[PDB]
Structure 1
Amino acid sequence: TDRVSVGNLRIARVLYDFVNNEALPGTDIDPDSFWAGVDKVVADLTPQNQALLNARDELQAQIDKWHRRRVIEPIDMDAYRQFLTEIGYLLPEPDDFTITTSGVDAEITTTAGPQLVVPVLNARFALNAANARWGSLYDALYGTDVIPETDGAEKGPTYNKVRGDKVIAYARKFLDDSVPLSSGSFGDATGFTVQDGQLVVALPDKSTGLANPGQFAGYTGAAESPTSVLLINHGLHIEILIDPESQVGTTDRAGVKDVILESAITTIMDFEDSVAAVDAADKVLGYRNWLGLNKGDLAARVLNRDRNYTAPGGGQFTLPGRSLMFVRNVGHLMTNDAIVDTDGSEVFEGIMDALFTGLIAIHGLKASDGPLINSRTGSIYIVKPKMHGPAEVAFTCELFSRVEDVLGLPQNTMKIGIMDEERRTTVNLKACIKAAADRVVFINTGFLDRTGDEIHTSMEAGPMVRKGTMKSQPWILAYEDHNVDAGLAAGFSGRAQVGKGMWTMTELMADMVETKIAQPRAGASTAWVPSPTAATLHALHYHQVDVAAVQQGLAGKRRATIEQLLTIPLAKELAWAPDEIREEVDNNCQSILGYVVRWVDQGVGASKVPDIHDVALMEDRATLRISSQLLANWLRHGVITSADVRASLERMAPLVDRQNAGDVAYRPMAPNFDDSIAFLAAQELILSGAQQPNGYTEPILHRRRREFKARAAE
């Protein structure tokens, strides 16, 4: 074949060449000893990796049997919880502690703000995310529905002045609320001056300074009529751009051209649920973009330089122009044929990701060719998804230690962002944080994956409530609060991020601005957004809410009990009219088909996907886990029949077809269903759902995408 032998490993040539030619030079790692390290790490850690995956299985089987041997009305929580304890699912909670993680950048320890997640296989997206640290508020307001397209203020082929004026008024209001003047409002401002280290704002009748002079952070141009004024509020920068000669500036009372907000403070470059990578060629493409980002030479459009300002006093300084990058590795489950052993057995992809994304990240710790791209404090930031419990966390930390040795990095260089998205992590969260107490830089919650796990875990208990209902169930509200509580009690405030989930409705920005404010109000120092535009709008929330104060107020509170966490989301007796059952089935089948068809046919793992009511959603692969699990649960307990499932898939497929009309490379699923690899993938996810380990959709998706790629190669 086309593989390179390195001890017991057989490495795909594309990967071997990529690493030797592009990734290794400049790192001062001996190529030969790097590869020997790969072979030794893979050999040493593979059995523990497999042991952990079998443990998930054995635990799940015991819970399955517990439910099946019982026939009682409601679950006896006391009994249930004692059972989870005996079998090792629920572990004892350790004593209080404070995390000791060190060498972490300010963006993570201190600054509260939006966090972008983007598919690393899409160079354009990744570049846009990296540059999304600063974004135009005017663009974000004019371009979306945050300013209503009421009569007269609608978006046309060209500039609407009525609408522009609403934009301007909106941002004036933001400035008054965020950086208030001593007297009067920015709405009446006439000009900006810097007089002896102090900001002077001219009003029609008088002039005034800031109510808090310290929020003045700097300017550009001459103090006597600056080209911009830089402000700071809750650690986030705001920049007023001054230019009376611009399209918008000409019509403005102070000649203001735009307001620029520091938005995406950090970004997660994603190798997991937002991308489709099923072989060596797909992995190399992702690795190559990750390398381009870290070397700062990725182009598809390039990376921004830092921003230059004059201090208020008159000196000079500089602010980062790029979002600080994390990478999200895949989790413990999947293998990938980018490397096989002599037996033909695929190597664990999570193990490979640590080695290769870790190797590659070394470049971000040094000079691009300009200044060094990423971490100035010398850290590598890796998000590790889908872990179940503190043993799996300890394993990931040991994998990182071993990689650090192979790479010649100081111990604890590789920091860990722990996703709390699996039930066995949730109920043992404190122990999970403790297992990573010297590497952890965040914890984070989310709707989709965690709900998918909830469904699979109690699959045998009975029929679950509908998908839309899940978002307001006691278990999940408790899960959200417990996560914040565990983080703050572990000393995250001032040290590590406490993060919340993605806003998926990309076009519903008015709704996001209205509702997402709940997350920083709950003490989240960060939350996920789908686009640079959403990052700029969500940044508004951090100007309104003092997250640090919120966190300080929550300290010491125990707002969720183990009993609440363990409250299974079972439907009541006879909860749904027949029409309601049908809507939910259609809803879920459309969700699966819509996402699956792009994934299997085009290898796209994230995009704006129209839902059943044509609302544009940007969800990752976890949308598949939840939908397939709910349908599998409804089929399992006799809520619906296999003909209902079939009929819905067939009803939804043409709909998904016409929803993809704009796409030149799209191939329809209807009417030849059993010919469409994608349609068959969607069906398999449902009918085999209950048998997939923890409801994970990767084994099936990966197989079907590989099958599609093979067909197309003929």
Structure 2
Amino acid sequence: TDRVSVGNLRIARVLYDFVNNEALPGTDIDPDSFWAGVDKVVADLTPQNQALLNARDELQAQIDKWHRRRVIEPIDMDAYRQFLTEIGYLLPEPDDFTITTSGVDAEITTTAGPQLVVPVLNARFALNAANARWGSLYDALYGTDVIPETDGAEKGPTYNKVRGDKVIAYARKFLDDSVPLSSGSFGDATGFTVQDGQLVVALPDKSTGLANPGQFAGYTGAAESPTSVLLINHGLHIEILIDPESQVGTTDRAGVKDVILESAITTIMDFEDSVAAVDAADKVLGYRNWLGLNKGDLAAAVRVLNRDRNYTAPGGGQFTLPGRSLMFVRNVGHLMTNDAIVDTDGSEVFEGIMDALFTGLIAIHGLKASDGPLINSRTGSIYIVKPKMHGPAEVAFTCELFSRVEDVLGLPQNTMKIGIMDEERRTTVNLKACIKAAADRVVFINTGFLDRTGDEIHTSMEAGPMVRKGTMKSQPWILAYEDHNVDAGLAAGFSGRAQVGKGMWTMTELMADMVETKIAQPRAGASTAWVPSPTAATLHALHYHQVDVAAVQQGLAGKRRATIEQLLTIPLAKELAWAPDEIREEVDNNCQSILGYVVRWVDQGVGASKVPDIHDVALMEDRATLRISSQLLANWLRHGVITSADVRASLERMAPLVDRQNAGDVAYRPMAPNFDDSIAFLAAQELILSGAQQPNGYTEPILHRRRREFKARAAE
């Protein structure tokens, strides 16, 4: 075969060559030392990794049996909690402590703003994401439904000046709200000059300054005639571009062309739930993009990474603001193996261990000058998001895994920082202990609420039928879970030190709703929350201007707003909650969601994209939504809500629907009418019917297997 032998390992040639020829040069790490380190880290940590997974199996088995020796319905909370305690699921809270993480960048410790997540396998999206640090507010307002397409203000093939005027007025009002004038309104401004180092705004009757002069951050061009004016509010920059000779500028009363918002302050380059990668060839594509990102030289077809932005300080001197979001990388979690490396017995190597070694190695390039200044962390950290951990022993393992990798890479200890996803129940209920296990590495906690819902369903699979998917977002457990996350963070001293993050808005086209509703996240003390696109980053940024996150977090200090009983309130459906037609649309909804996502995953290897749902609402969802949908259907089938023919009929009904929605594509092979000849259709069916039997309801084992099958089939 085509592998390279290194001690006990057999490494796929593509990955071996990539590491040697692309990743290693420039690092000063000796190739022989690196590979021997890989072999030794893998040898030392593999049995512990496996034991952690066995522990999940043991715990879930005990829970399944507890429910199966079932009473007559309502759960006895005191008994249940005592049970969780006795089996080591629910562990004691450690005493109060404060995190000690150092060498973290201001983007994480201090700045509250949007956090963008993007599939690393897509080079052009990853590039747009890195550049999303700065975004046009005019484009984001004009191009979405935040400005209502009413009579007269609708989007056409050419610019609609009536709609344009609304965009302008929306932005003026934002300016008045965020950086107030001493008197008057930006709506009445006729010009901007800089005089003796202070901003002067001409009104039609007089001139005025900012109510708070300190919000004047800089400018470009001559002071007497600046091309732009830079402001700051709540640590976020706003830049008024001034150009009377432009399409929009000629219409504006002050010659204003656009308002640019500092938007995606950080971006997560994703190797996990938003990509499909099932072998070395797939991993390498991802590693190569992550490499191009850190070196500054990634470029896509049809392009490049933005340079830093130049300004003149009011006081007088040239300075620079970052032109890119600070980049995290999301590694895969502890579950999966990947044949990119096998051992001598032919066993696949743990993929999470590989990601640490390789994304860790590659990240070193972002700590040094690109060939321009260094791309990423100026304070010397590597930021890794670690998803899907179950409890504090699993966090401690990641800690030791990073420590060992730091040794192999010749990096100082604690260089590799951890963004902890709070997205599994055993982590939620032991959160304080989970943070403590990462006390000198943690840079965020985040409520990954979609995965969290999946785990909620799987954990209590045998308890009874669960409420519908759309109901989950408002169940007591999840609300308690959101508050409990913030409390634990603030109490560990995250304020000023680490991000307290919240979850993804998935409805990419429903931007007016996002602007209206996602404001609840910073209001809840979240210093960050996830957005699916640069456009969504720009709009979510509005929320950080209206909400003083720092102040909100100070007010929340010391409070305990969720009990363990609330956390443990299983989302069981009640007596006769649904009519026949309600059950049927919930089934169709889920079968459509599964099919539309799985067909692109297995056939084209796309792990995330805009997928229209049943009512054609565009959704940017990923593997976690699949986890929920398959687990819910498995749960309804398990408890007799629906029959196996119900499931079949719905799959078979929804399948041509999906073929139609994707009739546009060219690599698309239709599932109907020969369903059993469709590897994707079979994968979809398997995720439901075998769903209850997947470890913690995870979808990767079925998905990886079927994608690999498809790839193999398309080669004979």
**Counterpart position of 1:223:** 223
- Between the aligned partners of 1:121 and 1:73, the Cα distance in structure 2 is 47
Aligned-pair distance for 1:664?
Answer: 2.0
Cα deviation digits, residues 29-68 of structure 1 (max 9, x gap) = 0100100000000000000000000000000000000001
What does the per-residue CA deviation read over 1:508-567, in whole Å, with 9 as the maximum and x for residues that have no partner?
000000000000000000000010000000000000000000000000000000000000
Instruction: State the identity as a percent.
Output: 100
Contact 1:279 1:337 in 2 (8 A): yes
For residues 150-188 of structure 1, give each alpha carbon's deviation from its aligned partner in whole angstroms, at most 9, with x where no partner exists: 011111111110011000000000000000000000000
For 1:549-586, what per-residue CA distance to the aligned partner results, in whole angstroms no more than 9, with x for missing partners? 00000000000000000000000011100000001000
Q: Which moved more, 1:68-77 or 1:297-306?
A: 297-306
Which residue of structure 2 lines up, in the alignment, with residue 240 of structure 1? 240
Aligned-pair CA distance for 1:622:
0.6
Structure 2: distance between partners of 1:494 and 1:678: 47
CA distance in 1, matches of 2:405, 2:311: 40
CA shift digits 1:218-255 (9 cap, x unpaired): 10101101000000000000000000000000010000
Is this contact kept in 2: 1:116–1:535, CA < 8 A? Answer: yes
Q: List per-residue Cα deviations over 1:99-145 (Å, max 9, x = no partner).
A: 00000000000000000000000000000000000000000000111
Is the contact between residue 529 and residue 535 of structure 1 (CA under 8 Å) also seen in structure 2? yes
| C-alpha distance in structure 2 between counterparts of 1:665 and 1:139, whole Å | 32
> Contact 1:685 / 1:697 at 8 angstroms: preserved in 2?
yes
3-state SS, counterpart of residue 382 of structure 1: strand
Give the drift of 1:363: 0.3
8 Å contact 1:475–1:568 — kept in the other structure? yes
CA apart distance, 1:713? 1.0
CA distance in 2, matches of 1:210, 1:123: 42
State the shift of 1:663 in Å. 1.3
Q: Is the aligned partner of 1:656 residue 2:665? A: no
Residue 602 of structure 1 corresponds to which residue in structure 2? 604
Q: Distance in 2 between matches of 1:56 and 1:657?
A: 38
Alpha-carbon displacement from aligned partner over 1:412-454 (angstroms, at most 9, x marks no partner): 0000000000000000000000000000000000321000000
Gaps of 5+ in 2: none
Give the distance between the partners of 1:700 and 1:300, measured in 2 at CA: 35
Question: Which digits, 9 at most, give the CA deviation of each residue in 1:356-409, with x for residues without a partner?
Answer: 000000000001110000000000000000000000000000000000000000
Residue of structure 2 equivalent to 1:556: 558
Q: For residues 45-102 of structure 1, what are the alpha-carbon distances to aligned partners after superposition, in whole Å with 9 as ceiling and x for unaligned?
A: 0000000000000000000000011223310000000000100000000000000000
Task: After TM superposition, give the deviation of residue 278 of structure 1 in Å.
Answer: 0.1
Contact 1:123 1:300 in 2 (8 A): no
Q: Is the 8 A contact 1:232 1:238 kept in 2?
A: yes
- In 2, Cα distance between equivalents of 1:508 and 1:279: 36
Q: Give distance in 2, aligned partners of 1:315 and 1:6.
A: 54
Q: What is the root-mean-square deviation of aligned Cα atoms in Å?
A: 0.6
Q: Secondary structure of 2:75's partner?
A: coil
Per-residue deviation, residues 164-214 of structure 1 (Å, max 9, x unmatched): 100000000000000000000000000001010111000000110001000
Q: Which moved more, 1:184-193 or 1:290-299?
A: 290-299
Q: Secondary structure at the match of 1:630?
A: helix
Contact 1:442/1:499 (<8 A) preserved: yes
**1 CA distance for matches of 2:673 and 2:694?**
28
Q: Which residue of 2 aligns with 1:352?
A: 354
CA distance in 2, matches of 1:48, 1:315: 55
* Alpha-carbon distance between aligned partners in 2 of 1:506 and 1:218, rounded to the nearest angstrom: 33
What is the CA-CA distance between 1:505 and the residue it aligns to? 0.3
Retained in 2: the 8 A contact 1:64–1:460? yes
CA contact (8 A) 1:118 1:126 kept: yes
Superposed, 1:107-146 pairs within 5 Å as 107-146=107-146
Supply the distance in 2 between the matched residues of 1:44 and 1:371 (Cα, whole angstroms): 37
Q: State which drifts further: 596-605 or 64-73.
A: 64-73
Q: Give, in whole Å, the separation in 1 of the partners of 2:469 and 2:145.
A: 26
Matched, 1:198 2:187: no
What CA distance in whole angstroms lies between the structure 2 residues aligned with 1:139 and 1:517? 20
Measured after TM superposition, the shift of residue 661 of structure 1 is: 2.0
Contact 1:525 1:547 in 2 (8 A): yes
Corresponding residue SS for 2:483: helix
Task: Give the secondary-structure state (helix, strand or coil) at the position aligned to 1:442.
Answer: strand
Q: Write the distance in 2 (CA, Å) between the matches of 1:73 and 1:379.
A: 51
Q: CA deviation at 1:667?
A: 1.0
Q: Distance in 1 between matches of 2:628 and 2:435?
A: 26
- Specify the alignment match of 2:486 in structure 1: 484
Partner in structure 1 of residue 261 of structure 2: 261
More moved, 440-449 vs 358-367: 440-449
Does the residue aligned with 2:226 lie in a helix, a strand or coil?
Answer: coil
2:80 maps to which residue?
A: 80
What SS is found at the alignment partner of 1:135?
strand
Alignment counterpart, residue 711 of structure 1, candidates 705, 710, 713: 713
- By how many angstroms is 1:621 displaced? 0.5
C-alpha separation in 1, matches of 2:143 and 2:325: 22
Q: Deviation at 1:596?
A: 0.2
Measured against aligned partners, the alpha-carbon deviations of 1:310-358 in whole angstroms (never above 9, x if no partner) come to 0011222110000000000000000000000000000000000000000
Whole-Å separation in 2 of the counterparts to 1:324 and 1:314: 27
Tell me how far apart the structure 2 counterparts of residues 637 and 122 of structure 1 sit (CA, whole Å). Answer: 40
Distance in 1 (alpha carbons) for counterparts of 2:400 and 2:430: 19
Q: Deviations over 1:583-629 (max 9, x none)?
A: 10000000000100000000000100000000000011011100000
Contact 1:488 1:551 in 2 (8 A): yes
Q: Secondary structure at the match of 2:264?
A: coil
Match of 1:678 in 2: 680
Distance 1:33 1:504 in 2: 44
Residues 473-496 of structure 1 deviation map (CA, whole Å, 9 limit, x = unaligned): 000000000000000000000000
Do 1:124 and 1:300's aligned partners in 2 also have CA atoms closer than 8 Å? no
The C-alpha deviation readout for 1:249-282, integer Å capped at 9, x for no partner, is 0010000000000000000000000000000000
Q: Secondary structure at the match of 2:108?
A: helix
How far residue 301 of structure 1 moved from its aligned partner, in angstroms, is 0.7
Matched, 1:24 2:29: no
1:580 aligns with 2:579: no
Does the 8 Å contact 1:137/1:537 carry over to 2? Answer: yes
In structure 1, the partner of 2:572 is: 570
**Mean Cα deviation higher: 129-138 or 296-305:** 296-305
- Distance between the aligned counterparts of 2:161 and 2:565, measured in 1? 56
Q: Does the Cα contact within 8 Å between 1:458 and 1:568 map onto a contact in 2?
A: yes
User: In structure 2, what is the Cα distance between the partners aligned to 1:141 and 1:285?
Assistant: 35
Q: Conserved in 2, the CA contact under 8 Å of 1:227 and 1:242?
A: yes
**Alignment partners' CA distance in 2, 1:223 and 1:579:** 67
Q: Is the 8 A contact 1:608 1:617 kept in 2?
A: yes
Name the structure 1 match of 2:276.
276
Q: d(CA) in 1 for partners of 2:661 and 2:182?
A: 53
User: When the two structures are superposed, what TM-score results if normalisation uses the length of structure 1?
Assistant: 1.00
Instruction: Give the drift of 1:12.
Output: 0.2
Give the number of equivalent residue pairs. 714
1:300 is displaced (CA, Å) by 7.1
Distance 1:367 1:446 in 2: 34
